[PDB]
Write a protein that binds this ligand. Structure first.
Ligand SMILES: CC(=O)N[C@@H]1[C@@H](O)[C@H](O[C@@H]2O[C@H](CO)[C@H](O)[C@H](O)[C@H]2O)[C@@H](CO)O[C@H]1O
Ligand code: CA
Length: 232
C-alpha cells in the first residue's frame, strides 16, 4: 500500500523557513554499443531495474541543484546511432555540453501547488520518462536519502515506440503541502525529448514553467509528515 500510486497522494510539511528553490538532478552516461552495431543503442534502459539501481553502473556525469523553470525540450539529432554533444535548456542549471543523443537523467524534490484541487500532469518523452509522485510512492517526507531507491509503481510513464508513449496523472493536491516527486529520463539514441505540463481548473492554459513549484528540502531525523489532512 505505502508506495502504490494514488489519486490522493501524501504530501509533506517541512519545517523550512527559507525553502531551496528547484529540484536536484543527477546526470549519468548512456554509452552506445560498439560502433556499427545494429541495434546500435544499449537496451538497458528498458530493464525494469535500470531506473532503480542500473543507472548507477554507468558514469556519474554530475550532481546539480536548483533545477527550476521550463524543463521541456526537443533535441533534434543531426545523425542517428551517433553520439553528439549539445546543451540542456537553461532551467537545468547545467551549462557544459553533454551527449544529448544518449544520456540518463534523474530529478527529485518536492512539488508545491499554487491552488488546492485537481492537478493533471501530462508527459511525453523520447525515449523514456517515469514519474513517481507523493510520499511513499516517490520517497518519504524529509527522508529521501534513506528511501530513495524504494519508489513504487509509477504514477505516469512514457516510452517512445511502446504502447504508452504519452501519459498523464490526475491527483488532488493541497496548496499548503510539498509532494515528493521523482522524474527519471533516458535518451538511448538520436532525438531526445521531455515534456511535462500541468493543468488545473484555475487556468485554462497548461503550466509549463515550474519555477514557483519545484523545491528541495534537507532530510531530518524524524521526517516531516504533512500537517494538513482531510481524511476521516
Ligand atoms: C540513421 C540511423 O542509422 N538510424 C536511425 C535510428 O538510430 C533512429 O533512432 C530512433 O529515433 C527515434 C525518434 O524518431 C528515437 O529517438 C529513438 O530513441 C531512436 O533510436 C531511427 C529513427 O530515426 O531510424 C534511423 O533514422
Ligand atoms: Ca531517442
Amino acid at each position: 500500500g505505502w508506495t502504490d500510486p494514488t489519486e490522493f497522494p501524501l504530501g509533506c510539511s517541512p519545517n523550512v523557513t527559507t525553502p531551496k528553490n528547484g529540484l536536484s538532478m543527477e546526470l549519468y552516461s548512456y554509452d552506445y554499443l560498439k560502433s556499427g552495431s545494429n541495434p546500435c543503442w544499449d537496451a538497458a534502459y528498458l530493464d525494469p531495474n535500470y531506473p532503480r539501481t542500473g543507472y548507477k553502473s554507468h558514469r556519474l556525469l554530475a550532481k546539480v541543484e536548483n533545477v527550476a523553470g521550463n524543463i521541456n525540450f526537443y533535441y533534434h539529432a543531426p545523425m542517428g546511432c551517433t553520439s553528439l554533444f549539445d546543451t540542456l535548456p537553461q532551467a537545468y542549471n547545467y551549462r557544459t555540453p553533454l551527449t544529448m543523443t544518449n544520456f540518463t537523467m534523474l530529478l527529485y524534490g518536492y512539488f508545491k501547488p499554487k491552488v488546492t484541487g485537481y492537478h493533471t500532469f501530462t508527459i511525453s518523452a523520447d525515449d523514456l520518462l517515469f514519474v513517481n509522485f507523493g510520499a511513499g510512492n516517490a520517497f518519504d517526507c524529509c527522508k529521501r536519502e534513506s528511501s530513495a531507491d524504494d519508489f513504487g509503481n509509477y504514477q505516469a510513464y512514457a516510452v517512445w515506440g511502446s504502447q504508452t508513449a504519452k501519459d498523464d496523472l490526475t491527483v488532488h493536491l493541497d496548496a499548503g503541502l510539498y509532494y515528493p516527486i521523482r522524474i527519471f529520463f533516458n535518451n538511448r539514441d538520436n532525438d531526445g525529448a521531455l515534456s511535462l505540463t500541468l493543468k488545473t481548473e484555475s487556468d485554462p492554459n497548461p503550466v509549463i514553467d515550474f519555477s514557483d513549484y519545484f523545491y528541495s528540502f534537507d532530510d531530518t531525523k524524524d521526517g516531516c509528515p504533512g500537517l494538513v489532512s482531510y481524511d476521516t
